[PDB]
Amino acid sequence: MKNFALIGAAGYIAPRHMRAIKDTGNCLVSAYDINDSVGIIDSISPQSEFFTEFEFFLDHASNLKRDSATALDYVSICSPNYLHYPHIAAGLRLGCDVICEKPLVPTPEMLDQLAVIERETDKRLYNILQLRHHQAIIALKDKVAKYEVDLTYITSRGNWYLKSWKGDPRKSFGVATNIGVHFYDMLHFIFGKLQRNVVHFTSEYKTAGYLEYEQARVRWFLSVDANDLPESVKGKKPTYRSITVNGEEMDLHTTSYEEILAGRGYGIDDARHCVETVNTIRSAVIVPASDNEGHPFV
Amino acid sequence: MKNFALIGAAGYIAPRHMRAIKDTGNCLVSAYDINDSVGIIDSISPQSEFFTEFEFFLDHASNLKRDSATALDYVSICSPNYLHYPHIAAGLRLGCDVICEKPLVPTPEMLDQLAVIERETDKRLYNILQLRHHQAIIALKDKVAREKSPHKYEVDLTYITSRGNWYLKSWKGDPRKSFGVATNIGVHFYDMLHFIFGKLQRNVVHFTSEYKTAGYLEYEQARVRWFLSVDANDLPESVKGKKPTYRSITVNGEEMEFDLHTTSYEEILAGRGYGIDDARHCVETVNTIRSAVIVPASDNEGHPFVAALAR
Amino acid sequence: MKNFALIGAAGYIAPRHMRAIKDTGNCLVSAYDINDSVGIIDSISPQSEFFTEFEFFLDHASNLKRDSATALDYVSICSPNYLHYPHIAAGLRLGCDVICEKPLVPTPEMLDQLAVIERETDKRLYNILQLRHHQAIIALKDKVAREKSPHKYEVDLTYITSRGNWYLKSWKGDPRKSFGVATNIGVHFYDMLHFIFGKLQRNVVHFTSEYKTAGYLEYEQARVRWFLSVDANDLPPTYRSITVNGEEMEFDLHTTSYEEILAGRGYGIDDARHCVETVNTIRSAVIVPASDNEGHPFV
Amino acid sequence: MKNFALIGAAGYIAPRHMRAIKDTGNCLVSAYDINDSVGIIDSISPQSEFFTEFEFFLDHASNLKRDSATALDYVSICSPNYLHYPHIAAGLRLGCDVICEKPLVPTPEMLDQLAVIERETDKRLYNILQLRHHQAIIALKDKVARESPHKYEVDLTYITSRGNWYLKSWKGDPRKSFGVATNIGVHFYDMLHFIFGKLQRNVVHFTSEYKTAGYLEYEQARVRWFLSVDANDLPESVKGKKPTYRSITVNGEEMEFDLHTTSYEEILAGRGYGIDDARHCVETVNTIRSAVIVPASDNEGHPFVA
Numbered sequence A: 001m002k003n004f005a006l007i008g009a010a011g012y013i014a015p016r017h018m019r020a021i022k023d024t025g026n027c028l029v030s031a032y033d034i035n036d037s038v039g040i041i042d043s044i045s046p047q048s049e050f051f052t053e054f055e056f057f058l059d060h061a062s063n064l065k066r067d068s069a070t071a072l073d074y075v076s077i078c079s080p081n082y083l084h085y086p087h088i089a090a091g092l093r094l095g096c097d098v099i100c101e102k103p104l105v106p107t108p109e110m111l112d113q114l115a116v117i118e119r120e121t122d123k124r125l126y127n128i129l130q131l132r133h134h135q136a137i138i139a140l141k142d143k144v145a146k147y148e149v150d151l152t153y154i155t156s157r158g159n160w161y162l163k164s165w166k167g168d169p170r171k172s173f174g175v176a177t178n179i180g181v182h183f184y185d186m187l188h189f190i191f192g193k194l195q196r197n198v199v200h201f202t203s204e205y206k207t208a209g210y211l212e213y214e215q216a217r218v219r220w221f222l223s224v225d226a227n228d229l230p231e232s233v234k235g236k237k238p239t240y241r242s243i244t245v246n247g248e249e250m251d252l253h254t255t256s257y258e259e260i261l262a263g264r265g266y267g268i269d270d271a272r273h274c275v276e277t278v279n280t281i282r283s284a285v286i287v288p289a290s291d292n293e294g295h296p297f298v
Numbered sequence B: 001m002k003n004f005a006l007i008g009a010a011g012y013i014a015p016r017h018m019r020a021i022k023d024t025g026n027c028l029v030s031a032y033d034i035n036d037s038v039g040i041i042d043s044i045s046p047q048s049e050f051f052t053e054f055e056f057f058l059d060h061a062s063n064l065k066r067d068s069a070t071a072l073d074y075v076s077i078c079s080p081n082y083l084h085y086p087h088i089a090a091g092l093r094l095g096c097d098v099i100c101e102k103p104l105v106p107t108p109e110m111l112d113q114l115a116v117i118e119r120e121t122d123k124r125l126y127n128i129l130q131l132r133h134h135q136a137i138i139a140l141k142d143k144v145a146r147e148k149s150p151h152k153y154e155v156d157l158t159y160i161t162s163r164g165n166w167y168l169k170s171w172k173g174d175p176r177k178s179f180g181v182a183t184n185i186g187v188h189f190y191d192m193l194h195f196i197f198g199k200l201q202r203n204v205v206h207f208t209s210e211y212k213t214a215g216y217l218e219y220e221q222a223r224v225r226w227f228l229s230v231d232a233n234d235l236p237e238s239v240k241g242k243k244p245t246y247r248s249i250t251v252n253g254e255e256m257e258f259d260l261h262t263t264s265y266e267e268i269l270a271g272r273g274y275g276i277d278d279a280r281h282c283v284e285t286v287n288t289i290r291s292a293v294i295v296p297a298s299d300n301e302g303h304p305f306v307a308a309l310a311r
Numbered sequence C: 001m002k003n004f005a006l007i008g009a010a011g012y013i014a015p016r017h018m019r020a021i022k023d024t025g026n027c028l029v030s031a032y033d034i035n036d037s038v039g040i041i042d043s044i045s046p047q048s049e050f051f052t053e054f055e056f057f058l059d060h061a062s063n064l065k066r067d068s069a070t071a072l073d074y075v076s077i078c079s080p081n082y083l084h085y086p087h088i089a090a091g092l093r094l095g096c097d098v099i100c101e102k103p104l105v106p107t108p109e110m111l112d113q114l115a116v117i118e119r120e121t122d123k124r125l126y127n128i129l130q131l132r133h134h135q136a137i138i139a140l141k142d143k144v145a146r147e148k149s150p151h152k153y154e155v156d157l158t159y160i161t162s163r164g165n166w167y168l169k170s171w172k173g174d175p176r177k178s179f180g181v182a183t184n185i186g187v188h189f190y191d192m193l194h195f196i197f198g199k200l201q202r203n204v205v206h207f208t209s210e211y212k213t214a215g216y217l218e219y220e221q222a223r224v225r226w227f228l229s230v231d232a233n234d235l236p237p238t239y240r241s242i243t244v245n246g247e248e249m250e251f252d253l254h255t256t257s258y259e260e261i262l263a264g265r266g267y268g269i270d271d272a273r274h275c276v277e278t279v280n281t282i283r284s285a286v287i288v289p290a291s292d293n294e295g296h297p298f299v
Numbered sequence D: 001m002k003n004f005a006l007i008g009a010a011g012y013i014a015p016r017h018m019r020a021i022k023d024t025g026n027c028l029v030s031a032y033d034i035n036d037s038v039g040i041i042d043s044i045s046p047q048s049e050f051f052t053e054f055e056f057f058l059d060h061a062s063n064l065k066r067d068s069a070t071a072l073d074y075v076s077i078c079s080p081n082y083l084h085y086p087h088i089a090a091g092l093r094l095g096c097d098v099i100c101e102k103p104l105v106p107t108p109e110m111l112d113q114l115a116v117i118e119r120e121t122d123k124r125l126y127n128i129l130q131l132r133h134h135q136a137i138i139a140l141k142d143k144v145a146r147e148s149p150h151k152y153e154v155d156l157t158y159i160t161s162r163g164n165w166y167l168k169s170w171k172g173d174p175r176k177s178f179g180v181a182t183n184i185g186v187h188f189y190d191m192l193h194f195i196f197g198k199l200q201r202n203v204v205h206f207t208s209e210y211k212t213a214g215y216l217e218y219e220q221a222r223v224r225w226f227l228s229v230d231a232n233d234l235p236e237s238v239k240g241k242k243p244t245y246r247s248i249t250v251n252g253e254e255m256e257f258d259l260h261t262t263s264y265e266e267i268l269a270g271r272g273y274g275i276d277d278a279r280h281c282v283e284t285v286n287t288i289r290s291a292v293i294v295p296a297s298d299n300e301g302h303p304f305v306a
Ligand SMILES: NC(=O)c1ccc[n+]([C@@H]2O[C@H](COP(=O)([O-])OP(=O)(O)OC[C@H]3O[C@@H](n4cnc5c(N)ncnc54)[C@H](O)[C@@H]3O)[C@@H](O)[C@H]2O)c1
Pocket: A007, A008, A009, A010, A011, A012, A013, A014, A032, A033, A034, A035, A077, A078, A079, A080, A081, A083, A101, A102, A103, A128, A130, A178, B036, B037, B038, C055
C-alpha cells in the first residue's frame, strides 16, 4: 500500500530490497541505476519505471507528487557508499522517508547534516541494521542483560572486488567502514557504549584492532584476502566467520522493512555510534598492541 | 584446460558462459565489463582477473601470451550487439578463437570483413546458435528431410515477451545499439527456421516499430508468417497476467514442443560448432528485415495479428 | 551580485555563458558537467565550485538556499538537447530562474509542462535566441515592419554545416539526443523568420532524413523555401545563404542575451513556442510533393 | 608524411599535440577520447577519424595497417596519468612508436615493464620532457659542467592556482594522478637532474593534496622545493595579477625564464627522450610519493614551509 523508489537497483543487494518491498505488500514504482542491466526487475515489479540518469528519475518522482495516490512514500538506497549522502538528501527533499544500506554515511558530521534535512522536511532516515532483528544476536543481548570477545571475518574476494568501487577508498571508505560497520553496530547493541578504540593494522585487503565496551573486551580482524583463511578452512568455505565470547563460537531485509513500516525503524540516533566507531578507525593512527589487545591473526 | 576470457561479464547472459566454461573443464582467466557489479564471478571462477577498461584488459591478455601455458585460447563475447564487431576483431587479433553471442553482427558486409580478419590472424569466429543443438529442433529437421512430401509446411511463429520500462531505456532499446526487433529478438528463430526448412526464397515485412514487427518468410520447405513483440499488450487474452511470455510456433497447425549454452561450448571444443558461413543465412535475413520497406500483406501472407492493417 | 550555476560547463558553448556571467558583473558559484575536463573555468571564474555528478550538484545547490546571500538566482543550461527538460525542471524546483540554450525543448507539450512548473515554483524560464539581438536581424525586422507591400517577401534559406568525423560520433549525431536536423540545426533560423515575418500559416516538408531536410514555410509576411544539411556533399566548411527577394542578407551576442534577461527582457516560453512548434512539426512531418514552386532549389 | 593517432584528444593539453603534428608537416589520422566534445580538431585536422570507445579506435588502427601508406607511425598520448601505461602498451603493440605526456608512468618497475614491450614490438617509447629544450636550462647545464668545487644553492617554487574543479577531476584522485609531486612536479625534478647530476638525498617535509615541499641533494646542488595548486600560497605581489608563480633561484639569482612542437621535431629527428632518460625523474617522484615526512633540519626547509 506504500510506494517505493529504489536507487542502485541493478546491483548485488538490490533484489533483496525489491523482494522486501513485494513481500510486505508494497509497490516498487520507480527505479534508478546508472547501469541498465536490471531485467531482474521484471520478475518482481514488472510495472516499475526505470531511469539511468538521476535528472530524469528526479523529474519523474517530482511529477508523481502531484497526485496523493501516485506520490512516493519511500526512497530505498543501495548505491555505492559515497553516494548515500546525496541520495538520502534528495530522498528526504522529495518528501519521502528514506531506507539506506550500511554504512549509512562515513562521518558523524554527515549525520548531523542529514538530521538538519529531516527537520526541514518532516521526513525520516532509516538504516538497514539487519543483524539486530536476528534471533541469536538478541538472545545474547537479552542474555548479557566483562565478556571475552574475539571477532574474525575473512571473506574471500576475487580480483573484481578491488577493481570495483569497493576497492576505491574514496568511494567505499575502507575496510572498517565497508566490511566491518554492522559488526561494530552489533557489538554496541549487545555490549553497550564504547570507551576505547585502537587500531593495530590497516590495508586495502585487511584491518585489525581493539575495542573496549562497558561489557566487552573485543579484539577484531577483517579481511577480503583468501590467504588469511586459517589452514583449517582453506579449500572448503570461501568465508571464515568466527565470533567467540570467552571461547564460545556463537529475509532479514524483509524483516527490516517490516519493522520500518510498523514505525520501529532504526534512525540516525541508532546508527550514530557505529558511524562514530568506523570514522575513528578510518582516520586512526596505527599502534603496536599491548595488554594482549592485538588479535591473534596479527 | 583451455583458457578463456569473457567480455560483457557483468550482464544477464554472462553467467551461462561462465558456467559453460567451468562445466567443460576449462578456465576463465580474465573478464571485462565496463560495469563492476560482477561478484557472481567468485561463485564460478574465483581466480579470474577482472577489468573495467578495455585498455587494461588488452594489456593483460597480451602479457598472457608470453607463456604458452597462460595464453588465451578463446575470447567469449556477451556485450551489446553493436560492440560485437570490434570485440571479435580484438579477440582474433589477440591470437584467440572467438565465441560470440547472437546476433553475431548486423550485416553481411560485416561478416565479409570479419572473414578477412580470420584469414589475417589465422583464428576462427564461432557464433552461439544454441537452438540448433535442441533435440526437438533436430528431430523436426530430420522429420522434414526424410518426409520429402511435395507440399510446403505452413508455419506460424509468434513470440511475445513482456518487457518492462527498463528495456527501452537500456541499449536494447536504442536501435543503433540493438539493431532493432528482428535482429535482436528474432535472429535465432530465423536461424532455426533455416536450419529446419532450408534456403530463404522470399522475405517480406508488414509492420515494424521499436516494440514489435511482423512479416512473411518463404523457405524451400515452409511458408512462415511471423510476429515478434516485447509489448505485454500483444499477449493473447488467455495468457495475460498468468504469464509474461508467449511463444507459439505451429507447423501445419500443430504446436512445436521445446544448458544449451554448455552444449554449444562442448560442440565448439569438439571441433564442431558454427562459424561465419553458418551464421551468414540468418544475418542476411535480419539485415533485409531491418531495412525493408513495408508492403501491404497479400495472399494470406499476413500473420493473424496484422489483419487490420492497410492492404 | 547575482549567483549563477552552469550545467554543461565543460562543453563547447559553455565558455560564452561563463563570460556573459562575468561580463555582466555576476558570479558563477557552481558548475556541473559529467566530464571533468573544465580547467577553462579558472580563467573566467576561479571561485566556482564544480561537480561531476548531479547528486552532488543538487545537494550543494539545495544547501545554498539556506542563506539568501549564497542562494542561487539563475541556473544556466548548456547540456545536450534531450537533457534540457529535466535540467530546467530541476532548476526551477531549486527556486531559481532558468536560462536554457536552444533548442529549448523539442515539443510544445513539453513547453506546457514547463509552464506548469513555472506556476508551481513562481520562477521563470528564459531561452537563448541570440540572433534576435544581431543588428542585421533587427534592421530587417524594422524594414519589413515599415514597408507597406501587400505582397509577401520571397525568402530562400540555405544552411549547410559540415564538420569532421567526430560530429556524428557525438550526441549531435544521435537522433534520440539531438532531436534531428530541423530541431538541432534549424531552430534559431526558424525563430529568426518568425521574428521578422510574423505568424506561421503553412508548414510543409519536402524531404527529411537524419542528415538534411527541406521544406516550405509561409508566414504572414514571407514565403520561405528552406534547406538544411550536415552533409558536405550538399555544399555549393559551411554555406549560409539567406536571400530576401533575391538579395543576400549581410550579417558577444550571448553577453547581450544575458544583459537582456537580467533587465527583465528575456525571451520566455511564449516567445520560444513559435520555433519549437515549427521544428516539432517538421520533425514528424509526412513529406508531400513540391508544388506551386514551393520547393527549395536544392531538392 | 608521418601518420599520427592522438589518445585523450578532447582534453586540455591535446590541442598542443594536434598543433605539433600539424606544424612538423605530419597528419593526424585518428583520435580517441571517451568524451565527445572534441570539435577543436576540425580547426587543425579536419579529416581525422574520431572514436569515443577504445574498441572501435583499435579496430580502425588495425585496419590502417593493411596499407603502408595509411599505417599509423606514432601514437601520441595525453590521457590521465594512470592510463599512460596501457595506452603506451597498445600503441607499441599496434606497431607504432609512442609519444607520451609526463609523468610517463609512476614507478621504475613500470618502466622496466614498458622496456620489455619495446623489445617484443621493436618499437620505441618517447616522453615529453620539454624543459630540456628551454634555451635557459641548456645554458645552465653547460655553465655548470665546465666550471666548480662547491654546490649550487637552489630554491624552486611553483605555485599554480587551481580552483575547486581540480580535486574533483582525475587530477585529485591519488590512484589516477599519483599525487601532486608526480603530476605537477615531475618535469622540474627532471630539469634538476638534467642540470645538476645524480640525486644523492631525497627528503620530504610536507605533503597534502594541494601542495608539497622537500629537499633534494644532487652531486652539484642543494635544492629546496615547494609545489602548490593553492592560490593562497602565491606571494602577495602576484595575488590578483597572475594565477601562477614560478621561481628558480641559483645562488640567490633568479633563473632567466611552443615547446611541444620542439619536442616533436626532436623525436622526429631521432633525438627523442626514452625510458632511460625518464628513469631518473620517475625514481625521484616514486620516492617522494611513498616518503615518510620528516621535520626540516639544517635549514633544508623551503622558506614557504615555515
Ligand atoms: N546489508 C547488507 O548485508 C549488505 C550486503 C551487501 C551490500 N550492502 C550495501 O549495499 C550497497 C550496495 O552494495 P552492492 O554490493 O549491491 O554493490 P553493487 O556495486 O553491486 O551495486 C551498486 C549499484 O549502484 C549503482 N550505481 C552506481 N552509481 C550510481 C548512481 N549515481 N546512482 C544510482 N545507482 C548507482 C551501480 O551501477 C550498481 O548497480 C552498499 O552501500 C553496500 O555497502 C549491504
